[PDB]
């Protein structure tokens, strides 16, 4: 069904929440009606991205300490790394409430050249010096910025209280910054030498340089990126009725379709002209449906209307008028069924809440639509995609009966694998649903009478008395129906005479 997967813990760069309860349109219409074409819009919220770069250094002491990251001064980035691709050995850091300087393997000051740190390109390149001791590291991490483009965060999860458009070169969002000017610099004419080959870039560029007390960052700078529409064309409905009741207009389409509700007041975004692109797309979609289905059936009247419907949906409506029976009950049945579905799903949302706390990996993956890593950071969930690995590069250990701790051995099989075919091999533990844990910690007081199975590739791997026996295909185990279609075989008794 799928290959193996390795899911490192998420760094919190991207956080996700639940859709929360939704208001169901309990009444299945039945009052006065009006016709018109419809197209709904919603918050575009497209976040800006830029493949920034992170620079920092590791510091340690040979005391049988207090290790933590350290930033890279701007002069060192443009002189040793940008020109020679080397890093300084000495680095100062607080040690037991007082500053102290480190060295490269307690030696004199020296320049250490940077080399790749991934061992095989499976993700971003990344570079390092060595696998008191000091190590210089550089990484081309990814970044995201919220819709207002006022703040951004890197892959490491540390928020940067500064807008990506910051810069004194021209008129930009230079007023948004919480850090002091001493922590920022904009290098002009930057030629961006690469650490993979040291071949220099193709043309000069202006690069912003900022550094928090934990590290140093940088990325190519441009004046501003205002090319973005506030709303996005979500759905285009061919037929949508406009009903009136309860002091709030109702916009409903086919029975199973979702019904919208508004305040009856025309929103001022279109008439203010700030949503020019929204009107253009809406008008194009409106004319598209009319010529596609109603040239001689209806007649367009007035101009498109806009409303900030419930739930944040921006509905664009265009009234229509007609130029000129068994469906009556069934429509009421289907409508009631749809409301039951909305109410039932609303209840199911509660069940999903405890499910995530119990198992965030499987729940987060199925909800988003793919194998993804996740852990609950309180009332909000963290998300980060997983890396895949082929079956050939994975092999289960012969036995989990770790002799180091008799009477208490691993409960799940220990697995050995390699990220890349030519890369080095690693050891870990086989989790649930082909999840290759990067660590081995599933200890259990192993006792007599053990006989279990574990998911492995397409089939299962048998085990008994904590020792590998053989594999077992999918069809080797009986299957039961954990469902109910729109329209059994179980037997055997226990050994009471044990």
């Amino acid at each position, epitope marked *: 069904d799928a290959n193996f997967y390795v899911c490192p813990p998420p760094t919190g760069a991207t956080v996700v929440q639940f859709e929360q309860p939704r208001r169901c349109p309990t009444r299945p219409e039945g009052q006065n009606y009006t016709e018109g074409i419809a197209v709904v819009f919603k918050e575009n919220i497209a976040p800006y991205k830029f493949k920034a770069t992170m620079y920092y250094k590791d510091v340690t002491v040979s005391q049988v300490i207090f290790e933590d990251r350290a930033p890279v001064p701007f002069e060192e980035v443009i002189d040793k790394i940008n020109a020679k691709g080397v890093c300084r050995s000495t680095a100062k850091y607080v040690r037991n409430n007082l500053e102290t300087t480190a060295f490269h393997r307690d030696d004199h000051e020296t320049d250490m050249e940077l080399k790749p740190a991934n061992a095989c390109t499976r993700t971003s390149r990344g570079w390092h010096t060595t696998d008191t001791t000091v190590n210089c590291i550089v990484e081309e991490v990814d970044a995201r910025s919220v819709y207002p483009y006022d703040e951004f965060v890197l892959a490491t999860g540390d928020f940067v209280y500064m807008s990506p458009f910051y810069g004194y070169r021209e008129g930009s969002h230079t007023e948004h910054t919480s850090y002091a000017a001493d922590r920022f610099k904009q290098v002009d004419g930057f030629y961006a030498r690469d650490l993979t080959t040291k071949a220099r870039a193709t043309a000069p560029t202006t690069r912003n340089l900022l550094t928090t007390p934990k590290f140093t960052v940088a990325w190519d700078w441009v004046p501003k990126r205002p090319s973005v529409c506030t709303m996005t064309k979500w759905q285009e409905v061919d037929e949508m009725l406009r009903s009136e009741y309860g002091g709030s207009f109702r916009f409903s389409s086919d029975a199973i379709s979702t019904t919208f509700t508004t305040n009856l007041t025309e929103y001022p975004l279109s008439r203010v002209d700030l949503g020019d692109c929204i009107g253009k797309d809406a008008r194009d979609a409106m*004319d598209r449906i*009319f010529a596609r289905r109603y040239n001689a059936t209806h007649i*367009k009247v*007035g*101009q498109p209307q806009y409303y900030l419907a419930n739930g944040g949906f921006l509905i664009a409506y265009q*009234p229509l*008028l007609s*130029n000129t029976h068994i469906q009556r009950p069934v429509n009421d049945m289907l409508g009631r069924v749809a409301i039951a579905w909305c109410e039932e799903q609303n209840h199911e949302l509660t069940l999903w809440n405890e499910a995530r706390k119990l198992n965030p990996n499987a729940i987060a993956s199925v909800t988003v639509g793919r194998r993804v890593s996740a852990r609950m950071l309180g009332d909000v969930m963290a998300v980060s995609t997983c890396v895949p690995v082929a079956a050939d590069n994975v092999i289960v250990q012969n036995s989990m009966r770790i002799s180091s701790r008799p009477g208490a051995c691993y409960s799940r099989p220990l697995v050995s694998f390699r990220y890349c075919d030519q890369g080095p091999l690693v050891e870990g533990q086989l989790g649930e649903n082909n999840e290759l844990r990067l660590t081995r910690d599933a200890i259990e007081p192993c006792t007599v009478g053990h006989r279990r199975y574990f998911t492995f590739g397409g089939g299962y791997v048998y085990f008994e008395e904590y020792a590998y026996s053989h594999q077992l295909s999918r069809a080797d185990i009986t299957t039961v129906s954990t469902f109910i279609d729109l329209n059994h075989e179980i037997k055997d008794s226990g050994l009471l005479d044990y």
Partner: antibody
Amino acid sequence: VQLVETGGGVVRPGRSLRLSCTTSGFSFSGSAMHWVRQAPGKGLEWVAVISHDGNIIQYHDSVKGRFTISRDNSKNVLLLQMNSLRVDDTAMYYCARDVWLLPATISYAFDFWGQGTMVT
Amino acid sequence: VIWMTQSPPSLSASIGDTVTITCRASQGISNSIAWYQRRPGKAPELLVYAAYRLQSGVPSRLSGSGSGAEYTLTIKNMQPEDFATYYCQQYYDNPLTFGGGTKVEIK
């Protein structure tokens, strides 16, 4: 159905003017209303629009701000006001009733007019 | 602003002829345009809405057509009351704008 405009007259540029249009013979409360301008011997050119309820108003770019439109169903009258008329503003004015299609819509057109009032 | 043109400004005809007028908008409104006519010494009166619908009083020999930005109004037969002026009015985008118009007179 008929409409009557009042308040016109020969006026030099550089001052304000107030005019209105009364309505009769139809459901003024349930219908929107228009205002049009026509220079001497030239074509027609729109001025403003007021819905049946009066919560939404639109104007022509050449008269936005300089002109205002207001209505009142209790006295079935359409009131308009403006300030500092220019020489090019010399034109014939009328109050036009919007084409009636549905109560919850504005046709952005018109089907009935009034006698009109001239301003120069 | 959306502009349009109407031609000819005036034409000479007689009872029993066939004539057609065209209104060409500056953009693809595709359906939002109306037509009007006016008798001398009298307020104008409407002809067509959305280029296809008619109203009360207009004879059956009146009918419009068009698409995109090209729109026309057809009069199948001339009568004594047809010697007047006609115009096109768009309502696709604000502000509303009128066309150049046309005129008709006896030969």
